[PDB]
């Protein structure tokens, strides 16, 4: 089966790409696996596959770290993401995000039910497993638990059956048969949980599938619209109906090739200690004492020689930057266009710790709008910061057509030189805020409200008559024929490969 | 003579460092020299020495580009700056800035007058030169003139004789015997000009010396205090009295080894067209039509085989970033400390286009102050933004002791994650603004006022009880013995030199 449709094939693809290091000597899930993975992510090294994990028994489990992190080379920087999607490994960010958006105006392709699959090769009932006895990693030394769930997909369905959501949300082992995790507004797992809580009759049927089809984990990380079943969106994106098997103990459906499946319930009444956790912005607050949602595990099924993917998240660069930031930016681009805003491109700069999104403006269309910075900033912020797709993003930077928003250096240049602090900005205090950002949840103001800004890095004439500058750079401040001469004579005059 | 005391020896030092490319074939001062230099600056290549400049006659002149720009290697990144100062080429920014500050609590060492020097090897009177006939560069294709003056030192003295200022300010050829240039508040050349204008009796005696002692051009670029004669400050910094010769046509004194000296007057009445110019923030606004100060040239003296240094300024990285930003940051650090503010370090991040300065706070001392963000931000902004040293800087970022302000990635991380937009900031609208920043002089508000901000990236407990987080990074989220094991086994597990 293709790499984008089968996690085991994706691992093979990384190996074939010379993008994998197979560690076959014993590695401790207590910090060592995650430390190696952290070092990989900080240096853009090859993904580690831990084939000999201390505490692995009866097939549970190996670990793959850094599944969606960056490669060192510029030419295939995003190759791991491209391998989630059947794209060439040289694909640009624009191409990856366009692939992730492509299903937004296609008919869904609903999934296909099959009678079995590799995820049924092994099973453990309610008397045969103990989650405290599995080689669950301690990912950061001050974490409040062993975070089994950093790269699996939670599966929950609305009470009426009409919406099945797939999403990533963290979870850690609470005891032999329970997890605790984040279930917070406005996330779809929270929205669906609220539906079950208002109905009041039962706990939420739940499954958590690890090592799912890579195209599915991508959509799990993306804020596609309310009410949209990720399985059918992935089907449309890939052109293929995803094959799903029924859970043994409930009527949810999991990908047939899932590496590991937990089946059980998400409580509508119980909570338990959750966190702290070393999180996407680069921090952990040791001892934070929060309550989280509580999940009961009734069954585990798994592939022979199962592999658990793991995100050792924190400082740059890991899945929480490459996937959360970029996929939110993609959805924000679409949202803006659907609201008749002249946005061509969006990206969350890594330098901002993916807390900013830069929005590239088609300034010809902006000029025809005959508007002003104050008005336009307000309109953009209202659209984005009032929507779920804007949840994680605290600063929007508007830039004109000369800026490549996928290049953080150029975003930083434009922000720093074209946006006058205060005057060229609009603050939003009455919007939902993202409490995980330290200056929110551990800051001076309300953890859940405000702290957002639209920073207009459009210059005045971009609203009126057109750009009125040239850059003082090699590209723009010298004629073509001179630039070419300089390049052609560079080495010969004495000065200093694409792939490398 | 030592490299830091003699420009000709500095050129030799760059050659010996394998940091020079001697171009001995004809190069056009119309754009080509500057284009090569621009490419060097954008790629951190070796400095170009143009030994065969189309239009060079009777010794005037060769060009050295990129004299204070960056080297490619991390290990000697700042080596060209270190060679201005007799420091090892591996010197850190902290070491360079500490050297530039060292004279601030030393007695000046006044200069020594000598009867002659190399700058007297050749002369041209008022009938023998024409500035339009020299190989003055066109640096950017839309510049409003040929900018002879990008890396020389203007010399002007107060009417009472008590203060002789050395500073860099741009100037371009107006006609055969005049320049126009920037003379703007609060700069010392402007302050002294105002003194002469209030006296009303004569034009300002003036000299402009190119290819001065490197330690002198550094101080020329630094906002040392009002009334302080740069020559004596450089003397104290270097431990050596600088040797100066008298001008032929006035009673000013120039460095004895200056490559080229212009002698004349800065008018207290006349102006002429000046600019536009491709400037430090990366822009030119073609056609801008400003009036600037007008200089009359009465005499040229020069060394045999004179070399004109040139800054091809614009987008990162050139002398306008390495010298303007860093030296302003140094002075701001000292200013803060003199005002009893607990600042240990300051740097202008390149990523900010040197419009920000990050201020590292000694948070133990901050805690003892028993203050708050609002109060502390206001105090810091008042000190800095009301002072000349803060002129060019529009955003101050306060960071705690864990942040290395000389590392832009870490400044950006702290700003993006620790400063809540709006709430954690104080805007300053009633301070002098820097009109050269596009969002000022070509923006939506007053060109010369406001647009400044203090952004507090200190976390709340840094004011009270101490840092309450650990970073989610390899360094902080794993114990020492594990980190060392990972590093020691890195290659052997399959993963990937200081100088490279
Ligand atoms: C890629 C990825 C995404 C997420 C997370 C991680 C990764 C690797 C963790 C390492 C596990 C850290 C974790 O903080 N985490 C996480 C999370 N969203 C939450 O509500 N809770 C979480 O704990 N998202 C983001 C969500 O996946 C997206 O916001 C998605 O849009 C949600 O799907 P939906 O609600 O739109 O269907
Ligand atoms: C290093 C360097 C410094 C400056 C400049 C350049 C370089 C290379 C140019 C390429 C020529 C561009 C130019 O815009 N320019 C420049 C300038 N200051 C001005 O008033 N006017 C200028 O046109 N400074 C900055 C000043 O040199 C410092 O602000 C210094 O502090 C002044 O000295 P003082 O008034 O404190 O004595
Ligand atoms: O653990 C963390 O990094 C995260 C928790 C959340 C919650 C919601 C959205 C993104 C993330 S990222
Ligand atoms: O030409 C430009 O880059 C500059 C003009 C000025 C004026 C004052 C201070 C710095 C600079 S930098
Ligand atoms: K999703
Ligand atoms: K603007
Ligand atoms: K100076
Ligand atoms: K703060
Ligand atoms: Mn969803
Ligand atoms: Mn001065």
DSSP secondary structure string, A14-51?
HHHTT-EEEE-S-B-TBTHHHHHHHHHHHHT-PEEEES
**Preferred mutation among A280, A284, A417 to probe B, highest tally of B CBs within 10 A:** A417
- In A182-252, at which residue ranges do the beta strands (DSSP E only) sit? 204-210, 243-246
Query: What residue's CA is closest to ligand 4, atom 1?
Result: B279
Percent helix, percent strand, percent coil in chain A, to nearest 5: 30, 25, 45
Cross-chain Cβ contact B478/A395 below 8 Å: no
CA distance from start to end of chain B: 31
Facing residues of A302 across strands? A122, A260
Residue appearing with tokens 């402007």:
B190
Q: Are strands B356-361 and A122-124 parallel, antiparallel or unpaired?
A: unpaired
Q: Residue A270: enclosing H or E segment and its boundaries?
A: strand A260-274
B283 alpha carbon, closest ligand: 4
Q: Of A405, A425, A402, which is closest to residue B444 (Cα–Cα)?
A: A425
**How many residues can be counted in chain A?**
500
Q: How many helices (H) and strands (E) does chain B have?
A: 14, 22
| 3-class DSSP state of A293 | strand
Going by C-alpha positions, the residue among B111, B125, B153 that lies closest to residue B245 is B111
Q: What is the DSSP letter of B242?
A: P
Tell me the C-alpha distance between B456 and B359, whole Å: 10
CA–CA distance, A235 with A242 (Å, rounded to integer):
6
CA distance B451 to A400: 21
As given in the structure block, the two tokens for residue B315 are 């987008």
Reading phi first (left if > 0) and then psi (alpha if -120 to 50, else beta), residue B86 is in: left
The C-alpha angle B93, B95, B100, rounded to 5 degrees, equals: 95
Going by the DSSP 8-state scheme, the letter that residue A133 receives in this structure is G
DSSP summary character for residue B57: B
Sign of the alpha-carbon dihedral angle for B473, B475, B478, B483? positive
Query: How many helices and strands in chain A, by DSSP H and E?
Result: 14, 22
Quote the strand ranges of A168-247, DSSP E.
171-175, 178-181, 204-210, 243-246
Contact B454, B394 (CB under 8 A): no
Q: Helix, strand, or coil here: A322?
A: helix
Contact A472 B40 (CB under 8 A): no
Report residue A194: phi and psi, to 5°.
-60, -40
Residue written as tokens 């639209």?
A454
Which of A66, A168, A357 should be mutated for ligand 1, with most atoms under 8 A from CB?
A168
| Contact criterion met (CB below 8 Å) for B319 and B296 | no
- Ligand 10 centroid to Cα of residue B231, in Å, is 10
Peptide bond into B186 cis (omega under 30): yes
- What are A256's two structure tokens? 């047939």
The ligand 4 atom nearest the CA atom of B279: 3
Tokens encoding B147 = 């900018």
Q: Are A155 and A261 in contact (CB under 8 A)?
A: no
Domain boundaries, chain B: 1-330, 331-459, 460-500
Tokens standing for residue A109: 């392709």
Find the radius of gyration of the CA atoms of chain A: 23
| 8-state DSSP, A305 | T
Bridge partners (DSSP) of residue B42 are: none
Nearest to B294 by CA among B192, B138, B175: B175
Contact of A76 with A67, CB cutoff 8 Å: no
Residue B167 near residue B189, CB atoms below 8 Å: yes
User: Are the Cβ atoms of A495 and B422 closer than 8 angstroms?
Assistant: no
What six digits make up the tokens of A216?
A: 């599915």
CA distance A269 to chain B (A): 31
* Three-class secondary structure of residue B84 per DSSP: coil
Q: Does the annotation place B163 within a ligand binding site?
A: no
Among the partner residues A412, A422, A477, nearest to B140 by beta-carbon distance: A477
Q: Which residue of A has its CA nearest to B317?
A: A473
Q: Are B165 and B171 in contact (CB under 8 A)?
A: no
**How many other β-carbons are positioned within 10 Å of the β-carbon of residue B491?**
9
DSSP H or E run through B364: helix B363-369
Cβ atoms within 10 Å of B239's Cβ, excluding its own: 11
Question: Looking at A243, A259, A279, A319, which residue is catalytic?
Answer: A279
A229 alpha carbon to ligand 5 midpoint, in Å? 9
Distances in Å between the alpha carbon of B278 and those of A430, A437, A471, A472, B365? Answer: 42, 39, 8, 5, 43
Top mutation candidate among B223, B279, B310, B353 for ligand 4, by most atoms within 8 Å of CB: B279
Residue B267, H or E segment: strand B260-274
Resolution for this model in angstroms, one decimal place? 1.0
- Residue that has been written with the tokens 């088609």 in this structure: A362
* Separation CA A467–CA A441 (nearest Å): 40
**Strand (E) or helix (H) holding B299:** strand B290-302
User: Distance (Å, rounded) from C-alpha A224 to C-alpha A187?
Assistant: 11
* Residues of chain B neighbouring A353 (CB-CB closer than 8 A): 412-413, 416-417
CA dist., res. B459 & res. B104, Å (int): 32
Annotated binding residue at A169?
A: yes
Size of interface A-B (CB pairs under 8 A): 286
Q: What phi, psi does B229 have (nearest 5°)?
A: -75, 115
In a 3-state reduction of DSSP, which class is residue B437?
A: coil
Residue A15 · residue A26 · CB < 8 Å: no
Q: Is B9 annotated as a binding residue?
A: no
Does the annotation count A279 as an active-site position?
yes
Q: How far is B11 from B303, CA to CA, in rounded Å?
A: 14
Contacts of B32 in chain A (CB under 8 A): 482, 485-486
Separation of alpha carbons B131 and A365, rounded Å: 47
Instruction: Quote the ligand 8 centre to B471 CA distance (angstroms).
Output: 16
C-alpha to C-alpha distance for B320 and A312, rounded to whole angstroms: 40
Kind of pairing, strands A122-124 and A290-302?
A: antiparallel
Using the CB atoms, write b or e for A200-216: b if 16+ within 10 Å. Answer: eeebbbbbbbbbbbbbb
How distant is the alpha carbon of residue A369 from its chain centre? 34
Return the percent helix, strand and coil in chain B, to nearest 5. 30, 25, 45
Q: How far apart are CA A202 and CA A197, in angstroms?
A: 8
Taking an 8 Å cut-off on Cβ atoms, the answer to whether B282 and A409 are in contact is no
Q: How far apart are CA A367 and CA A362, in angstroms?
A: 9
Q: Which one is catalytic: B274, B279, B331, B425?
A: B279
Q: How far, in Å, CA of A67 to CA of A45, rounded?
A: 11
- Residues, CB within 5 angstroms of ligand 5 (ion): A 167, 220
What does R_g of chain B's alpha carbons equal in angstroms? 23
What is the rounded CA–CA span in Å between residue B25 and residue A188? Answer: 68
Neighbours of B499 (CB within 10 A): 7
Cβ–Cβ under 8 Å, residues A137 and A172: no
Distance from CA of B332 to the nearest CA of A (A): 20
Tracing tokens 């040392």 back to the chain, one arrives at B224
Of the candidates A150, A358, A19, the one whose C-alpha atom is nearest the C-alpha of residue B494 is: A19
Q: Ligand 1 — pocket residues by CB below 6 A?
A: A 150-151, 165, 167-170, 182, 184, 187-189, 221-223, 279-280, 311, 313, 319-320, 323-324
Distances (CA, A) of A124 to A207, A219, A267, A301: 15, 29, 21, 6
Strand pairing class (A243-246; A204-210): unpaired
- Cα distance between residue A29 and residue A13, in whole Å: 24
């Amino acid at each position: 089966q293709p790499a984008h449709l089968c996690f085991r094939s994706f691992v093979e693809a990384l190996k074939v790409d010379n993008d994998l290091v197979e560690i076959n000597t014993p590695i401790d899930p207590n910090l060592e696996a995650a430390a190696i993975t952290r070092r990989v992510c900080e240096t853009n090294d090859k993904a580690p596959l831990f084939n000999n994990l201390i505490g692995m028994k009866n097939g549970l489990f190996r670990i793959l770290g850094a599944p969606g992190s960056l490669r060192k080379s510029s030419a295939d920087r995003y190759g791991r993401l491209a391998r989630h999607l059947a794209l060439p490994p040289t694909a640009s960010m624009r191409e990856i995000l366009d692939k992730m958006l492509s299903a937004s105006d296609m008919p869904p392709i609903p999934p296909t039910i099959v009678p079995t699959g590799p995820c049924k090769e092994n099973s453990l009932d309610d008397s045969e497993f103990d989650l405290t006895e599995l080689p669950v990693p301690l990912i950061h030394k001050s974490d409040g638990g062993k975070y089994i769930q950093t790269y699996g997909m939670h599966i929950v369905q609305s009470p009426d059956g009409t919406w099945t959501n797939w999403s990533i949300a963290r979870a850690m082992v609470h005891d032999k048969n329970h997890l605790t995790g984040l279930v917070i507004p406005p996330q779809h797992i929270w929205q669906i949980h609220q539906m079950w809580k208002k109905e009041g009759r039962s706990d939420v049927p739940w499954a958590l599938a690890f090592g799912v089809p890579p195209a599915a984990i991508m959509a799990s990380s993306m804020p596609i619209p309310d009410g949209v079943t990720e399985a059918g969106y992935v089907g449309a994106m890939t052109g293929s109906s995803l094959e799903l098997v029924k859970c043994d103990t409930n009527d949810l459906y999991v990908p047939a090739t899932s590496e590991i499946v937990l089946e059980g319930t998400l409580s509508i009444s119980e909570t338990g200690p959750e966190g702290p956790f070393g999180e996407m912005h680069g921090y952990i607050f040791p001892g934070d004492t929060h309550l989280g949602a509580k999940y009961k595990v009734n069954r585990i099924t798994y592939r022979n020689n199962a592999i658990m993917p793991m995100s050792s998240c924190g400082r740059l660069t890991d899945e929480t930057h490459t996937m959360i930031g970029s996929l939110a930016a993609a959805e924000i681009r679409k949202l803006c266009q659907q609201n008749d805003l002249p946005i061509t491109d969006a990206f969350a700069p890594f330098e901002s710790q993916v807390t900013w999104v830069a929005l590239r403006v088609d300034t010809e269309k902006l000029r025809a709008m005959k508007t002003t910075s104050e008005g336009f900033r307000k309109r953009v912020g209202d659209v984005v910061f009032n929507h779920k797709a804007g949840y994680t993003i605290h600063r929007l930077v508007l830039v004109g057509d000369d800026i490549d928003v996928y290049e953080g250096k150029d975003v930083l240049w434009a922000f720093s030189t074209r946006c006058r602090p205060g005057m060229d900005e609009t603050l939003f205090e009455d919007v939902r805020g993202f409490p995980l950002i330290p200056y929110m949840g551990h800051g001076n103001g309300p953890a859940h409200r405000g702290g957002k800004v639209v920073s207009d890095a459009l210059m005045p004439t971009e609203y009126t008559t057109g750009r009125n500058w040239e850059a003082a750079d090699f590209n723009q401040s010298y004629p073509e024929d001179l630039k070419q001469k300089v390049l052609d004579n560079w080495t010969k005059m004495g000065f200093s490969h694409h792939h490398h």
